[PDB]
């Protein structure tokens, strides 16, 4: 019934500006307080901003004062966060959230939107380089063999890794991306296979990075 | 600013057991806290607002209590759906509205030792001028593991990054990758590349090594 | 005066609406006035009335309710809600609430305790019709309470009765 749908997320250079939106449905939007709560990568929740039902009260956390404006249109059933002067600390998933009110006991955030990712980075959009993590038949072998491929130096998230065009799924671990000091991302995907199979089975990793439209297959041989 | 300190950072329990999660506030509060749940990749959802003010669709096994500086969320018997991150939040000395940092509720299982594998850099990566050496720990429990890189028996520091999977839904294990990144020139300056793994399931720490140049 | 002995500018206040549920409008100060390190702040609760039969409830925490945290709390007017504060030009004067609002009902009891701030809660009920716009005030001041180098806050209630009926 109740629905909150954000839009407007994406990539910004530092010092850039962005406008987030939250479209509401299934409730009388002009009788509820609305809020923005952010979640940095690897981190917990941080309240950003709140606006009362008829916009008579706005509230901000100290680090976004002067830079961020919250607003709403009750005819268009919409909530907005205008973010100027964006810093790398503003990198987060941003949630819109509904509450009954903004009294001195503030009401709980009872319904949340699905989130909008805001990445503030000086990096440009880059395809990945795919390198084999080759099964070595001593150092990667304890009766089963491990093998993988390393997906390095791409921006932004995400990449998808598949192995035998989807047919090899058991024993696959695709790791979470780690942001390197370059500002680019890197993950590895690994799979344990029978070491006996290494002579006969073919092993390719299918990496796709949709922002550069980069689809790579890389064969992983001993 | 009220700082909320959630304790423990990770709780390791089996389903059916009572889960007790603590939130400590940096000032005393007489108005109750608000608790939220977050499953991975998902938005947070409201769980409880008062002693018993559960949200729509939130079942009765969640209860909340506490006052002054000490607050607890109780899950009276865990369901497999409950293994998630939980956030407390104060709503009564504000602005700013502030949250606790989160407690992760993890499934407990028997101790499982990792399988350790080391991967040398490929020739294709070595053309680019960078060498990555990757150590893999597969299917271990608990998450606590120490991984040390040693190049010609010199301990590496500040040049590796670790990535841990989410806890596996089928067997409750973790997997970890440590990636040591060197330049090509520093990579061919040395011979032996070693990964040392210390874990509770291992009787002794496991070393996986190779010689550059395939022995 | 509004800001009191505290040196808080009007833009550095924290203002809030009352929690309005089921024709009862509530100002609850019981966590918002405790000693904070950024103190003293002004916490202003704003009660806007343009509807009939609103019960206004003001919850002001008592001295020794929690230990050490309300040890110098004061409330002005002492005879609230029967006496309120009104702002004339550059002054705060005590006035009678029966005189400012015709048809007003103050129950003598709140929750079997006396309708005075010394029981922690005051309460009054607004008439079905109001022809005259009135603004009046209550103070719940904790800003002389000091614990661990942290000072408490000054709470203001501002009731705005718009004409209705
Ligand atoms: Cl609708
Ligand atoms: Cl509704
Ligand atoms: Cl509406
Ligand atoms: Cl209950
Ligand atoms: Cl219930
Ligand atoms: Cl097992
Ligand atoms: Cl070895
Ligand atoms: N409002």
């Amino acid at each position: 019934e109740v629905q909150l749908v954000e839009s407007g997320g994406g990539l910004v250079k530092p010092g850039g500006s962005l406008r987030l939106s939250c479209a509401a449905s299934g409730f009388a939007f002009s009788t509820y307080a609305m809020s923005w709560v952010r979640q940095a990568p690897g981190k917990g929740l941080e309240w950003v901003s709140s606006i009362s039902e008829s916009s008579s009260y706005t509230y901000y956390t100290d680090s976004v004062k002067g830079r961020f404006t919250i607003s709403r249109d009750n005819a268009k059933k919409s909530l907005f966060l205008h973010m100027n002067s964006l810093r790398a600390e503003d990198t987060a998933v941003y949630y819109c959230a509904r509450s009954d009110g903004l009294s001195m006991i503030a009401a709980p955030f009872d319904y949340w939107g699905q989130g909008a990712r805001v990445t503030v980075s000086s990096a440009s959009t880059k395809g990945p380089s795919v390198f084999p993590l080759a099964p070595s038949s001593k150092s990667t072998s304890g009766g089963t063999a491990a093998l993988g491929c390393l997906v390095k130096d791409y921006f932004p998230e995400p990449v998808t890794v598949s192995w035998n065009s989807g047919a090899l799924t058991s024993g696959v671990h695709t790791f979470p991306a780690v942001l390197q000091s370059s500002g680019l991302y890197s993950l590895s995907s690994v799979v344990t296979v029978p070491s006996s199979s290494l002579g006969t089975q073919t092993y390719i990793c299918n990496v796709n990075h949709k922002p550069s439209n980069t689809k790579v297959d890389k064969k992983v041989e001993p | 600013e009220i700082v909320l300190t959630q304790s423990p950072a990770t709780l390791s329990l089996s389903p059916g057991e009572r889960a007790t999660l603590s939130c400590r506030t940096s000032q005393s509060l007489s108005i109750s806290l608000v608790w939220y749940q977050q499953k991975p990749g998902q938005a947070p959802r409201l769980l409880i607002s008062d002693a018993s003010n559960r949200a729509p669709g939130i079942p009765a096994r969640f209860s909340a209590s506490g006052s002054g500086t000490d607050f607890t969320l109780t899950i009276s018997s865990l369901e497999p759906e409950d293994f998630a991150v939980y956030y407390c939040q104060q709503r009564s000395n504000w602005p700013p509205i502030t949250f606790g940092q989160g407690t992760r509720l993890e499934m407990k299982r028997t101790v499982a030792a990792p399988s350790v594998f080391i991967f040398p850099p490929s020739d294709e990566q070595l053309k680019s001028g960078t060498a990555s050496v990757v150590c893999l720990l597969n299917n271990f429990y608990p998450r606590e593991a120490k991984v040390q890189w040693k190049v010609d028996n010199a301990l590496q520091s500040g040049n590796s990054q670790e990535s841990v999977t989410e806890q596996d839904s089928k067997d409750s294990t973790y997997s970890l990758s440590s990636t040591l990144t060197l330049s090509k020139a520093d990579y061919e300056k040395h011979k032996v590349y070693a990964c040392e793994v210390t874990h509770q399931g291992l009787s002794s720490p496991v070393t996986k090594s190779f010689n550059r140049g395939e022995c | 005066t509004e800001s009191g002995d505290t040196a808080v500018s009007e833009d550095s206040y924290d203002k809030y609406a009352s929690q309005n549920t089921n024709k009862e409008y509530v100002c609850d100060f019981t966590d918002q006035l405790k000693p904070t390190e950024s103190g003293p702040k002004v916490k202003k609760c704003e009660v806007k009335v343009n509807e009939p039969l609103i019960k206004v409830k003001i919850i002001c925490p008592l001295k020794g309710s929690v230990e050490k945290l309300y040890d110098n709390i004061e409330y002005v007017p002492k005879k609230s809600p029967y006496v309120v504060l009104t702002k004339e030009e550059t002054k705060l004067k005590e006035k009678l609430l029966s005189k400012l609002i015709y048809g007003l009902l103050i129950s003598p009891t709140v929750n079997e305790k006396e309708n005075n701030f010394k029981e922690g809660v005051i309460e009054f009920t607004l008439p079905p019709v109001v022809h005259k716009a009135t603004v009046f005030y209550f103070i719940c001041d904790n800003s002389k309470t000091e614990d661990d180098n942290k000072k408490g806050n000054r709470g203001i209630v501002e009731v705005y009765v718009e004409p209705y009926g």
Side-chain angles (χ1 to χ4, degrees):
Chain A
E1 328 273 16
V2 179
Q3 218 157 348
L4 298 170
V5 178
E6 291 104 307
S7 67
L11 282 64
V12 283
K13 284 170 173 201
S17 78
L18 203 58
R19 193 225 317 174
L20 301 180
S21 286
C22 175
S25 79
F27 62 99
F29 173 77
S30 48
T31 68
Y32 292 93
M34 296 298 297
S35 300
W36 296 101
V37 174
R38 77 186 171 188
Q39 180 161 47
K43 297 309 191 144
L45 300 173
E46 181 182 29
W47 170 77
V48 176
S49 195
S50 286
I51 189 165
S52 67
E53 47 174 38
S54 297
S55 294
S56 319
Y57 299 90
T58 57
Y59 301 93
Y60 297 94
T61 202
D62 279 340
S63 58
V64 309
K65 268 163 187 189
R67 302 187 302 115
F68 285 22
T69 308
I70 192 164
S71 62
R72 67 195 288 156
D73 189 358
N74 293 341
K76 282 278 211 146
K77 290 174 111 179
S78 292
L79 165 71
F80 302 117
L81 193 69
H82 185 202
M83 304 172 321
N84 302 312
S85 295
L86 280 161
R87 327 169 170 156
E89 58 175 59
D90 301 311
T91 292
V93 179
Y94 285 73
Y95 298 100
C96 59
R98 193 195 83 171
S99 50
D100 282 357
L102 292 164
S103 300
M104 279 183 296
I105 304 168
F109 301 130
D110 45 32
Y111 288 91
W112 296 65
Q114 89 283 354
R117 200 172 265 275
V118 171
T119 315
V120 191
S121 177
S122 312
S124 287
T125 297
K126 199 177 178 201
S129 297
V130 189
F131 305 118
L133 307 162
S136 78
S137 303
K138 304 178 171 195
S139 276
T140 84
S141 279
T144 63
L147 67 99
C149 64
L150 173 78
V151 184
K152 214 184 106 72
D153 297 337
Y154 62 96
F155 194 79
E157 265 281 269
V159 291
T160 59
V161 186
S162 177
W163 278 88
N164 279 1
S165 293
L168 190 61
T169 54
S170 77
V172 176
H173 297 283
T174 294
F175 285 97
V178 292
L179 185 63
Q180 304 161 312
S181 59
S182 53
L184 307 179
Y185 288 104
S186 182
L187 60 81
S188 50
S189 179
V190 298
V191 57
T192 49
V193 312
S195 58
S196 83
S197 80
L198 295 175
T200 61
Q201 292 298 108
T202 317
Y203 292 112
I204 61 170
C205 66
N206 319 293
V207 184
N208 182 239
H209 183 250
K210 208 261 176 298
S212 55
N213 278 323
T214 294
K215 206 188 289 178
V216 181
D217 307 333
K218 181 46 69 190
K219 182 156 54 178
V220 188
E221 283 159 347
Chain B
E1 177 172 356
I2 314 295
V3 180
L4 316 193
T5 298
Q6 264 172 274
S7 167
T10 313
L11 203 38
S12 293
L13 291 176
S14 289
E17 308 182 310
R18 189 177 316 267
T20 294
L21 294 85
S22 307
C23 189
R24 185 196 260 184
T25 64
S26 63
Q27 299 192 357
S28 167
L29 295 172
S30 310
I31 301 304
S32 76
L33 263 40
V34 167
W35 291 84
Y36 304 94
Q37 185 193 72
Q38 194 179 26
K39 284 137 150 177
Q42 274 176 25
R45 83 165 174 180
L46 178 64
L47 290 176
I48 201 168
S49 154
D50 284 311
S52 299
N53 198 9
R54 293 162 285 259
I58 294 312
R61 66 183 178 260
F62 298 97
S63 60
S65 68
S67 62
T69 198
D70 297 313
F71 295 88
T72 58
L73 174 75
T74 298
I75 320 173
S76 56
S77 76
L78 289 166
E79 295 285 328
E81 309 91 73
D82 296 337
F83 293 91
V85 181
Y86 295 88
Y87 299 96
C88 53
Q89 181 227 293
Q90 62 88 19
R91 65 208 271 214
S92 54
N93 197 330
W94 86 272
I97 292 168
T98 61
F99 293 82
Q101 80 267 22
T103 286
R104 190 174 66 98
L105 184 51
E106 166 189 25
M107 197 161 320
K108 194 177 167 194
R109 53 147 300 157
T110 69
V111 175
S115 301
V116 192
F117 313 94
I118 194 173
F119 300 92
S122 58
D123 284 330
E124 190 191 348
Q125 195 193 355
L126 283 168
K127 287 146 186 185
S128 68
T130 321
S132 306
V133 199
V134 170
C135 196
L136 172 58
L137 284 60
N138 217 37
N139 298 344
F140 60 101
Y141 189 84
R143 202 187 150 215
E144 177 187 3
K146 205 83 185 192
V147 172
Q148 295 205 298
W149 284 105
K150 272 152 101 183
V151 177
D152 284 349
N153 303 317
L155 185 57
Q156 295 313 291
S157 200
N159 46 6
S160 51
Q161 285 153 324
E162 306 200 335
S163 192
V164 200
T165 64
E166 304 267 2
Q167 194 179 18
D168 180 85
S169 53
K170 294 148 95 211
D171 61 17
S172 300
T173 67
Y174 298 87
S175 291
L176 178 141
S177 78
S178 197
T179 307
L180 180 77
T181 55
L182 313 178
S183 66
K184 183 207 181 103
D186 205 78
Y187 178 65
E188 289 152 334
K189 197 177 130 223
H190 307 101
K191 298 176 148 65
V192 183
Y193 287 82
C195 180
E196 296 198 343
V197 174
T198 313
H199 193 263
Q200 144 176 23
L202 296 171
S203 296
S204 285
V206 161
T207 312
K208 288 299 176 162
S209 49
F210 66 95
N211 300 332
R212 176 194 52 90
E214 291 182 345
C215 291
Chain C
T1 66
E2 285 204 12
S3 61
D5 320 340
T6 69
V8 197
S9 49
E10 201 187 351
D11 67 334
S12 295
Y13 292 3
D14 282 329
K15 56 168 188 173
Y16 312 84
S18 49
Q19 64 115 353
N20 297 4
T21 301
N22 269 343
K23 80 192 157 299
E24 185 193 34
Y25 294 11
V26 180
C27 292
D28 198 334
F29 282 103
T30 40
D31 268 357
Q32 206 59 266
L33 297 183
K34 274 165 197 210
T36 67
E37 285 186 344
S38 313
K41 312 173 145 282
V42 165
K43 305 291 193 179
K44 185 200 231 181
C45 186
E46 294 178 348
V47 196
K48 307 201 209 162
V49 175
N50 48 52
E51 284 170 22
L53 309 170
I54 298 307
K55 186 183 263 288
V56 177
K57 184 196 193 165
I58 293 151
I59 301 158
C60 175
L62 300 94
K63 186 186 293 190
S65 54
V66 192
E67 298 185 282
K68 308 295 147 225
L69 296 183
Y70 299 116
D71 281 0
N72 298 95
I73 196 156
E74 299 181 347
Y75 43 83
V76 173
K78 293 293 174 194
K79 295 213 76 158
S80 296
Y82 301 95
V83 190
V84 302
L85 285 163
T86 306
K87 198 174 176 176
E88 292 314 312
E89 184 229 5
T90 70
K91 209 46 185 176
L92 272 191
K93 312 179 167 173
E94 300 197 344
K95 277 194 171 278
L96 291 172
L97 197 53
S98 304
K99 210 174 171 179
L100 285 156
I101 299 176
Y102 167 73
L104 182 128
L105 288 173
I106 296 161
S107 169
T109 272
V110 178
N111 281 328
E112 293 104 56
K113 306 194 172 184
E114 182 186 343
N115 198 347
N116 190 231
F117 269 136
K118 74 198 183 213
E119 306 287 79
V121 50
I122 65 156
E123 210 163 88
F124 57 96
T125 308
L126 295 165
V129 165
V130 161
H131 285 294
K132 189 200 192 337
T134 55
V135 171
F136 55 94
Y137 302 83
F138 305 90
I139 314 293
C140 181
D141 199 355
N142 206 30
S143 58
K144 317 225 77 165
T145 304
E146 219 186 309
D147 177 32
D148 290 352
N149 203 12
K150 316 159 66 174
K151 270 210 253 191
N153 297 324
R154 179 172 191 103
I156 329 291
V157 182
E158 175 163 8
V159 193
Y160 318 78
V161 196
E162 285 151 78
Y164 59 82

